[PDB]
Amino acid sequence: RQWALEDFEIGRPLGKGKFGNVYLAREKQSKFILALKVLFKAQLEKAGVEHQLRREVEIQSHLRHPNILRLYGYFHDATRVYLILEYAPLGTVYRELQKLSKFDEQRTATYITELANALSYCHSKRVIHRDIKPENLLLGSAGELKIADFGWSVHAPSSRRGTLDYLPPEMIEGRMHDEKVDLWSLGVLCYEFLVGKPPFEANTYQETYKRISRVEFTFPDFVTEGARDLISRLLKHNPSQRPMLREVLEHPWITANSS
Ligand SMILES: Nc1ncnc2c1ncn2[C@@H]1O[C@H](COP(=O)(O)OP(=O)(O)O)[C@@H](O)[C@H]1O
Ligand SMILES: O=C(O)c1cc(-c2ccc(Cl)cc2)c2cc[nH]c2c1
Ligand SMILES: O=C(O)[C@@H]1CCCC[C@H]1C(=O)O
Ligand SMILES: [Mg+2]
Ligand SMILES: [Mg+2]
């Protein structure tokens, strides 16, 4: 349970974070490969997010699902906080999308099924992820999707305040929100997986804000009827109008292309 930096051999950086970096690491005694998320105390204090960090730790450490990234523990020293995470060897869904440009209907529907199942488990504990995006979706050794970065995670309902690309209208506007925010994020993902870019993508935060607020998006011609139907059902301005995850999992386009 009590760890120290001296218990780990540090490898290359795995990625850059908002409050520090993620490094590959090996526990000296067991030779267990893992990821160490290193955060700077000064930066967290200045941002006034030292309690949201405690929330990320508390929420993620109690989740057990094959499509959710494990958080084994944490420790800290005079300047830094260290989160001990499960290593996701095939990287981010973000990098996969950058090299493939777009995913086919089968890969998309499979990822959407994996997400819906992980989100269903979260929502059963009244946990809202609120930061579902390709760079927070990691790939296990078998290429299985793993929800990661519980940095902004909270318990529903919440009226608590990167790009806005995956945030629903109620979360922007700083209004009260529940588990329905993750259903909106799911529709933005589905679109991005098939099209290569999120539906409200813009040059500025200001322009993206407006597009989300208006639910202003169009589909390229290659997007099928079934895909258009599922996305359009998820991207409802009214959170109450968004379907349950059970409905997403039973959608004909999902059942026909997954897995
Ligand atoms: N367990 C992990 N295995 C592999 N890469 C990881 C892991 N955790 C994070 N990363 C990489 O580091 C990046 C930043 O990690 P993350 O927890 O998402 O940080 P932040 O809250 O700053 O955005 C990720 O997008 C990813 O590229
Ligand atoms: O004890 C401390 O002295 C302490 C502690 C923390 C801290 C916060 C969250 C977690 Cl999960 C672990 C440690 C932080 C975060 C910023 N300044 C700190 C000081
Ligand atoms: O883990 C982190 O980098 C942060 C902890 C504090 C809240 C915000 C969070 C994040 O950016 O994901
Ligand atoms: Mg992240
Ligand atoms: Mg984060």
Author numbering: 126 to 286, 291 to 388
What does the paper say about this structure?
Aurora A is a serine/threonine protein kinase that plays an important role in controlling early stages of mitosis, including centrosome maturation and separation, mitotic entry, and bipolar spindle formation. Localization and enzymatic activity of Aurora A are regulated by its interaction with the spindle assembly factor TPX2. The initial fragment hits identified from screening with the ATP site blocked by a high-affinity inhibitor were very weakly active, but guided by continuous crystallographic analysis of the inhibitors in complex with Aurora A, we were able to increase target affinity by more than 10,000-fold, clearly demonstrating the ability of fragment-based and structural biology approaches to develop potent PPI inhibitors when a suitable binding pocket is present. These compounds occupy a hydrophobic pocket on the surface of Aurora A, discrete from its ATP-binding catalytic site, which forms the interaction surface for a linear N-terminal segment of the interacting peptide from TPX2.
An early modification was to change the phenol group of 2 into indole while replacing the trifluoromethoxy with a smaller chlorine to give 3, which improved the KD to 1.26 μM. The indole-aryl core of the molecule lays in a hydrophobic pocket assembled from Leu169, Leu178, Val182, Val206, and the side chain of Lys166. The indole nitrogen proton forms a hydrogen bond with the side chain of Glu170 thus mimicking the phenol of Tyr8 of TPX2. The carboxylic acid group was observed to interact with Lys166 and His201. Furthermore, the electron density supported it being twisted from the plane of the indole ring in order to form a salt-bridge with Aurora A. Our analysis of ligands in PDB and CSD45 databases shows that carboxylic acids are more commonly in-plane with the aromatic ring (data not shown) and presumably this twisting incurs an energetic penalty upon binding.
